[PDB]
Amino acid sequence: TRAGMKGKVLGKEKKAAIIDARKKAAESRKNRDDKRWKRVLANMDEEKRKKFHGVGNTAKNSRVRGATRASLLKRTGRKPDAVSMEATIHLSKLLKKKTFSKRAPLAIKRIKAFVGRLMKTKDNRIDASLNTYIWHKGVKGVPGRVRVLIQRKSEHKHFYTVISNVPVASFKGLTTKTVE
Amino acid sequence: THIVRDVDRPGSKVNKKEVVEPVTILEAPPMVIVGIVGYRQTPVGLKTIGTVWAHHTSVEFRRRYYKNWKQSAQLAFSRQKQFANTKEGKVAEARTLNAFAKKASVIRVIAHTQLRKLRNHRVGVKKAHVQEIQVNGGSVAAKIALAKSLLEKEVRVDSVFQQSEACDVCSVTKGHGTEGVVKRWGVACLPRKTHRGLRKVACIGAWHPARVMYTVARAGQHGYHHRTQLNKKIYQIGRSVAVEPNQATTTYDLTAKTITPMGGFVGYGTVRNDYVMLKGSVSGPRRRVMTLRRPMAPQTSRQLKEKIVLKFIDTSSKIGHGRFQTKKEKNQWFGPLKKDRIRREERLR
Amino acid sequence: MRTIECEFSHFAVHPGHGRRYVPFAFLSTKPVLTFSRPKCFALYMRKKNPRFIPWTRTYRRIHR
RNA sequence: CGACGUCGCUUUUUGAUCCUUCGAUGUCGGCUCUUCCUAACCUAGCGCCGCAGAAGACGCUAAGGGUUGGAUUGUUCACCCACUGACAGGGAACGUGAGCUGGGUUUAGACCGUCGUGAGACAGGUUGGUUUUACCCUACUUAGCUGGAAAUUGCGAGAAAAAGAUUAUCCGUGCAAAGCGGACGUGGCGAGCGGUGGGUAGUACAUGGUACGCUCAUCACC
RNA sequence: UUAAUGAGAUUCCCUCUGUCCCGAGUUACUAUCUAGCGAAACGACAGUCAAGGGAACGGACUUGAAGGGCUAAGCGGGGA
RNA sequence: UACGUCCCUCUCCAAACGAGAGAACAUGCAUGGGCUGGCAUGAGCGGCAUGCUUCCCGGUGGGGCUCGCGUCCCGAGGCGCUGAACCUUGAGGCCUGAAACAUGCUCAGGGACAC
RNA sequence: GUGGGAUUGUGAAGGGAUCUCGCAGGUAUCGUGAGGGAAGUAUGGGGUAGUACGAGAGGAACUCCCAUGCCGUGCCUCUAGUUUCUGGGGUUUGUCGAACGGCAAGUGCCCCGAAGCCAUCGCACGGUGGUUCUCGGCUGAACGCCUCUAAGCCAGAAGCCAAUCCCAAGACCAGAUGCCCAC
RNA sequence: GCAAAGAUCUAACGGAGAUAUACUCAACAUGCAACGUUGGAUACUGGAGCGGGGAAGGAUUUCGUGCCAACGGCACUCGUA
Ligand SMILES: [K+]
Ligand SMILES: [K+]
Ligand SMILES: [K+]
Ligand SMILES: [Mg+2]
Ligand SMILES: [Mg+2]
Ligand SMILES: [Mg+2]
Ligand SMILES: [Mg+2]
Ligand SMILES: [Mg+2]
Ligand SMILES: [Mg+2]
Ligand SMILES: [Mg+2]
Ligand SMILES: [Mg+2]
Ligand SMILES: [Mg+2]
Ligand SMILES: [Mg+2]
Ligand SMILES: [Mg+2]
Ligand SMILES: [Mg+2]
Ligand SMILES: [Mg+2]
Ligand SMILES: [Mg+2]
Ligand SMILES: [Mg+2]
Ligand SMILES: [Mg+2]
Ligand SMILES: [Mg+2]
Ligand SMILES: [Mg+2]
Ligand SMILES: [Mg+2]
Ligand SMILES: [Mg+2]
Ligand SMILES: [Mg+2]
Ligand SMILES: [Mg+2]
Ligand SMILES: [Mg+2]
Ligand SMILES: [Mg+2]
Ligand SMILES: [Mg+2]
Ligand SMILES: [Mg+2]
Ligand SMILES: [Mg+2]
Ligand SMILES: [Mg+2]
Ligand SMILES: [Mg+2]
Ligand SMILES: [Mg+2]
Ligand SMILES: [Mg+2]
Ligand SMILES: [Mg+2]
Ligand SMILES: [Mg+2]
Ligand SMILES: [Mg+2]
Ligand code: NA
Ligand code: NA
Ligand code: NA
């Protein structure tokens, strides 16, 4: 980043000050707008009121107008060293019009990149159950979807993941979950 | 999309008869005026005299001066505002306006777009587009008065263009990268028997002059060029859907519908602001910003002076062969389905 | 313009859609036939009865 | 229109010559593609006929834009069938083979006619007969980086700029006028104009985001 | 003169078609970028043009017109 | 010194490679749901009914084999649950801002110049 | 003056001298437009009109409308083409004990098939002023009269130049502007 | 340029051939790429076979242990070296 925002230049304490300085400026402008719109909408007549639609943060399924998503996202803290997740990967959208003789080897590389991206890990081990599932219909017949179990372990400290297959009957209605 | 209309053209074989014409849709959220600029004429061309900035600018406008806005100090125009508020700033602004009034012959306004108003999900850019718009008509004093009145205020497209007029469209064409001579210039293909390939030009010049001329076709870049596109007829100027939901409803077709087709525009989404419906096609792909200009060619032909009345606007799906105009029509055709029955049973239980 | 119905499937055909076909052994009352999709014309040239194709209006009206 | 005579132009025909090339400049035609000339077929204007009208002839400026599809033949040339506003003539190493093609011409196989005692011959006929290489420089087409006016240096000074104690010693208006109207004060402390931040009301704008009234606190100029 | 036979030479008809009107879309391997490895042909010196004269078709000569430097992918006018 | 710029990262109106348009904790990305569309009725079970459809209706097969006019079996196909099942953004369709989408992941961004 | 380095080839430590370089710009927008390129071009129908002219046979044209050919620049709403979304379905031989799921036949084969790309096989658009040549005239002498010419002037071609359109500061723009730094 | 003969993937052992950092720092954004054996998975040859034996020709290329300077047009911990 630029020299005015580098962590090793400013320091931990100075860096934290800037973050709160921007946060309070954003919040101060926010709360002033909430009070202004509340007064105007209440003072407004019904003929003008029904025309303004969801400007008063009143409409349903319509987000919060004042701030941005991920600013209302509560941040619990750093995740533990050892975690486990279950996720679905849409393989068919990654392998479209690829050469038929390379589909199964390419799916292995895409899975390792997918897991390493959200786990911040360069050492990803493919379990024998997952390797069999990808190959069990030949090089060309890679399945459209796969459900995997990801486990991160630690042995600086080194981190690595082990990825295995989760056999399911249908993929409908499944989302990402954290297991124990 | 395409529309149906009646023709008023005496002497033609389609007089008082219905025709189908394809049209293009352009979303036009209001622009903001932030600057005034004056020009003077010299024996070597036009020279800028100065610029008068508005007292307040938007984050959209100020983002255009950065490559990484969210991690910057965000100091643009701060000293300018601080100085212009004081007494000396008023003197400087008065001097610049007097210079405009005394020595200028061309007046333009600096304006920019509103990407927050254009709540589009596929247009990724957040820094506003900026351009200059010339002010025509009247004297220089009247031009300056109008420019001063239009400062830090919004301008709508209907205040610039009327319904049954024409315009020019400045834009940039779609890109194709490197292309061969056959697709870049339109030369003929060689016979099947040709050794070393057949999609080429056989002879690229005579013995003398002993060099290749600039008039011979060569391979290279095709597409992504600027074009001006005279005489496009405006067929409709429509208001925002939040104000008038019945955008595509005419006097002849009373079905309540909007301008967005079933399933949305492919690769673009939903039209949420004011819009312009032009006849024909324009250069460039979807999501690209283009400029409408008042016509420069004479407007005297019957075709250019004909008034347009629409009778039908197509809103069927652009994915596949759309055969329904409305979701109500599709529901009327199909009736209750398994998913609807399951949902109703779950709601009852 | 008015909306026509497809010859084979009775789908609605709105202005600016479909193709029209004129057989040589034309019928005097209606000389021109309208089709909404290339699939409908292909089934017509195979001389298939619409009452057996389950996604046509003729089939639905019988089994309802 | 023009005999008998007589004077000139051109190098898109064939002759005449033998200056360059024989330790090699790939050779007929077609296909593809660009450009040039005018001695003008069509398209734009004029003049004149032995020009009533219609259809035409003979000229002048003018080369900006056009000038086709097929049967036979390797053809160029030619001829015929159709369309058209018209189906003009030429140059560019008889444009163009590391662009193609290889039908013709012109090796070695073989047949016929005529000639020769014969081996063999024939700008006579016939059939079959390898078409090699670009990654270098330049030209052309697109595509990137980057200095530089003493065109890399000199310190070697030139404004399609303003007008004054020699551009200093205020600002605006006015004709490079005559005039006119304004400008924070007494070392700290007061006043004014502003940028931010809180407390409060209503309005405008396309309506989540900005402006404005009052009040308070700070930071700057004066 | 001849039935049968012929990777022999020639003309016409039916069928068929991207041979053509007139081109468009897709696939594998290349070209293209990277890691490792790694040549040849050729090489007086070099390399922007117009006209002139000249061994009668110049990159160098005369008089004019251009020309900031370094690079990637192509191309087949010239380097007689 | 400071403002800042480039590389790493993410997106595609750009793209042989460079270059371009953008984003910088953002409905940004992922998965699911709904829409829009494609094909044409899934596996399984069953035949006067703990089957299907309403709130009463429907319910095969050319032939063949057993045991006593009956009752169990073999049989291509047909009917019902069933416009069902599956697919739908990826070189890159829509909906979280007209009326009638939801969850999960980010926890001081790293480096080099500017110097 | 200030700050960095370095001197000739035979061992180490201190000093001195000399030499070279740096000492002000960086980054982000909006514009100007010298110069270069350069494009639109033809035919038919209606009406004029069975009119003008002509004994008769016969037989036009301009203003103004409506179409089309060639060329040019784009576009994908419709129609058509293309499928390695091997999307959905069907079907042959082999094969996993059978059903299910499939797999092999360098995309097994057949039908339909979105998105994208694409067709004179689809759709859209293609302007304005000057200066002249050939020639026709005005006013006019030389030359008594006369005469478009000797001085002067008017009207004037698909020609030529500019506008519109494309690239554009090695055309070195003392054009304007946002922010930081130096003075 | 090293493109005919369809093709490899995974874990564990072995090996100097790695998880190889000056500050900061939780990990990614600072040690990549590549190898032999065994177990799984997926394919090919398809009996006119990259099957099992002979003649001509070759003459130690056969086998075990070790080793990796040169050679096996890339690589090697492997080899007809
Ligand atoms: K001669
Ligand atoms: K079923
Ligand atoms: K069914
Ligand atoms: Mg693109
Ligand atoms: Mg050949
Ligand atoms: Mg579509
Ligand atoms: Mg010779
Ligand atoms: Mg020679
Ligand atoms: Mg040669
Ligand atoms: Mg030679
Ligand atoms: Mg000649
Ligand atoms: Mg050759
Ligand atoms: Mg040649
Ligand atoms: Mg030959
Ligand atoms: Mg004899
Ligand atoms: Mg021959
Ligand atoms: Mg200098
Ligand atoms: Mg100087
Ligand atoms: Mg020359
Ligand atoms: Mg010069
Ligand atoms: Mg090159
Ligand atoms: Mg050459
Ligand atoms: Mg010019
Ligand atoms: Mg035309
Ligand atoms: Mg289609
Ligand atoms: Mg299509
Ligand atoms: Mg199959
Ligand atoms: Mg089978
Ligand atoms: Mg298969
Ligand atoms: Mg190479
Ligand atoms: Mg290779
Ligand atoms: Mg090769
Ligand atoms: Mg191979
Ligand atoms: Mg490693
Ligand atoms: Mg193994
Ligand atoms: Mg064998
Ligand atoms: Mg080797
Ligand atoms: Na030479
Ligand atoms: Na006179
Ligand atoms: Na066998």
CB B278 within 8 A of CB B290: no
Is A in contact with C (3 or more beta carbon pairs below 8 Å)?
no
Please tell me the experimental approach by which this structure was elucidated: cryo-EM
What percent of chain C is helix, strand and coil (3-state, nearest 5)? 25, 15, 60
Torsion sign, CA atoms B122, B124, B126, B128: negative
Helix (H, G, I), strand (E, B), or coil: what is residue C34?
strand
Q: Find out whether B323 is annotated in a ligand binding site.
A: no
Residues B194 and B178: their CA atoms lie apart, in Å, by: 23
**A5: which chain B residues are within 8 Å (Cβ-Cβ)?**
71
Output b/e per residue, B8-25; b: 16+ Cβ within 10 A. Answer: eeeeeeeeeeeeebebbb
Judge whether B217 is closer than 8 Å to chain C, CB to CB: no
In this structure, which amino acid lies at residue A119?
M
Q: Where are the beta strands (DSSP E) in B246-326?
A: 275-279, 291-293, 310-313
User: B282: which 2 tokens?
Assistant: 């324009």
Distance from CA of A5 to the nearest CA of B (A): 8
Q: Can you tell me which residue has the tokens 């999900």? A: B121
For residue C18, give every residue at least 6 positions away whose Cβ sits within 8 Å of its Cβ, in sequence order, or none: C4, C6, C34, C35, C36, C37
Q: Nearest Cα to A164, choosing from A178, A174, A152, A150? A: A150
User: B132: which 2 tokens?
Assistant: 């200059």
* Chain gaps in chain A, named by the residue before each (C–N > 2.5 Å): 155
Q: Which residue is nearest to nucleotide G124 (CA to C1')?
A: B280
Contact between B72 and A2 using a beta-carbon 8 Å cutoff: yes
| ∠ Cα B137 B282 B123 (to 5°) | 95
Output b/e per residue, C12-35; b: 16+ Cβ within 10 A. Answer: bbbbbbbeeeeeeeeeeeeeebbb
User: B319: which 2 tokens?
Assistant: 């994915």
Output b/e per residue, B248-272; b: 16+ Cβ within 10 A. Answer: bebeeeeeebbbbbbeebeebbebb
For residue B290, give every residue at least 6 positions away whose Cβ sits within 8 Å of its Cβ, in sequence order, or none: B26, B169, B170, B171, B282, B283, B284
CB C17 within 8 A of CB C36: yes
Length of chain C measured in residues: 64
Nucleotide minimizing C1' to CA distance for residue B208: D92
Output b/e per residue, B41-63; b: 16+ Cβ within 10 A. Answer: eeeeeeeebeebbbeebeebbbb
User: A49: which 2 tokens?
Assistant: 């009121």
Residues A39 and A43: their CA atoms lie apart, in Å, by: 6
Exposed, middle or buried, A22 (CB in 10 Å: 0-12/13-18/19+)? exposed
**HEC per residue, A128-178:** HHHHHHHHECECCCCCCEEEEEEEEEECCCCEEEEEEECCCCCCCCCCCEE
For residue A116, give every residue at least 6 positions away whose Cβ sits within 8 Å of its Cβ, in sequence order, or none: A122, A124, A161
Q: Find out whether B211 is annotated in a ligand binding site.
A: yes
Q: Separation of CA A102 and C1' H54 in angstroms?
A: 44
Contact between B71 and A53 using a beta-carbon 8 Å cutoff: no
Nucleotide minimizing C1' to CA distance for residue B181: D141
CB B258 within 8 A of CB B238: no
In this structure, which amino acid lies at residue A115?
V
Interface test with B, best of C2, C9, C17 (most B CBs within 10 A): C17
Residues A164 and A130: their CA atoms lie apart, in Å, by: 5
- Which chain B residue shows the shortest CA-CA distance from A52? B242
Torsion sign, CA atoms B42, B47, B51, B57: positive
Q: Can you tell me which residue has the tokens 């981190």? A: A159
DSSP count for chain C of H helices, then E strands: 2, 4
Nucleotide minimizing C1' to CA distance for residue A98: G84
User: A96: which 2 tokens?
Assistant: 């479209």
Radius of gyration of chain C (CA): 12
Q: What is the DSSP letter of B299?
A: -
Q: Nearest Cα to B297, choosing from B232, B235, B236? A: B232
Output b/e per residue, A147-157; b: 16+ Cβ within 10 A. Answer: ebbbbbeeeee
CA B275 to each of CA B178, B235, B306: distance values in angstroms, whole numbers, following the listed order: 35, 11, 21
Residues B264 and B326: their CA atoms lie apart, in Å, by: 12
Give the bases of strand G that a protein CB approaches within 7 Å.
28-34, 45, 65-67, 72-81, 84-87, 102-104, 106-107, 111-118, 123-128, 164-167, 169, 171, 175-180
Q: Nearest Cα to B231, choosing from B297, B187, B144? A: B297
| CA A133 to centroid of ligand 27, rounded, Å | 22
User: A108: which 2 tokens?
Assistant: 């292995």
- Which chain C residue shows the shortest CA-CA distance from B312? C1
CB atoms within 10 A of CB B166: 20
Q: Nearest Cα to B218, choosing from B205, B207, B209, B228? A: B205
Consecutive H or E run containing B238: strand B232-238
Resolution (angstroms) stands at 2.4
Contact between A2 and B242 using a beta-carbon 8 Å cutoff: no
**Peptide bond just before B245 cis, omega within 30 deg:** no
Q: What is the DSSP letter of B289?
A: -
Q: How far is CA C34 from the centre of its chain?
A: 6
CB B102 within 8 A of CB B48: no
CA B87 to each of CA B50, B98, B148: distance values in angstroms, whole numbers, following the listed order: 19, 17, 19
Q: Nearest Cα to C5, choosing from C36, C44, C43? A: C36
User: B175: which 2 tokens?
Assistant: 């890109």
Residues B141 and B121: their CA atoms lie apart, in Å, by: 43
Residues C49 and C8: their CA atoms lie apart, in Å, by: 9
- Measured in degrees and rounded to the nearest 5, phi and psi for residue B175 equal -100, 150
Residues B287 and B266: their CA atoms lie apart, in Å, by: 11
Ligand nearest to the CA of A100: 29
CB A62 within 8 A of CB A52: no
Q: What does the DSSP assignment read for chain A?
A: --GGG-HHHH-HHHHHHHHHHHHHHHHHHHHHHHHHHHHHHHHS-HHHHGGGTTTTS-STT---SSS-TTTS-----PPPSS-EEEEEEE-TTTSSS--GGGHHHHHHHHHHHHHHHHHT-S-EEEPHHHHHHHHBTBTT---SEEEEEEEEEE----EEEEEEE---S--TT---EEE-
Judge whether B1 is closer than 8 Å to chain C, CB to CB: no
CB atoms within 10 A of CB B341: 10
**B70: which chain A residues are within 8 Å (Cβ-Cβ)?**
none
Contact between B314 and C12 using a beta-carbon 8 Å cutoff: no
Residues C64 and B286: their CA atoms lie apart, in Å, by: 45
CB B162 within 8 A of CB B234: yes
Chain B residues 310 to 349 whose Cβ lies within 7 Å of strand E are none
Q: Which of B71, B73, B242 sits opposite A1 (nearest CB)?
A: B71
For residue B13, give every residue at least 6 positions away whose Cβ sits within 8 Å of its Cβ, in sequence order, or none: none
Q: Which of A1, A4, A53 sits opposite B73 (nearest CB)?
A: A4
Q: Bin C40: left if φ > 0, else alpha if -120 < ψ < 50, else beta.
A: alpha
Q: How far is CA B17 from the centre of its chain?
A: 31
CB B15 within 8 A of CB B275: no
Nucleotide minimizing C1' to CA distance for residue B279: G124
User: A142: which 2 tokens?
Assistant: 């890679």
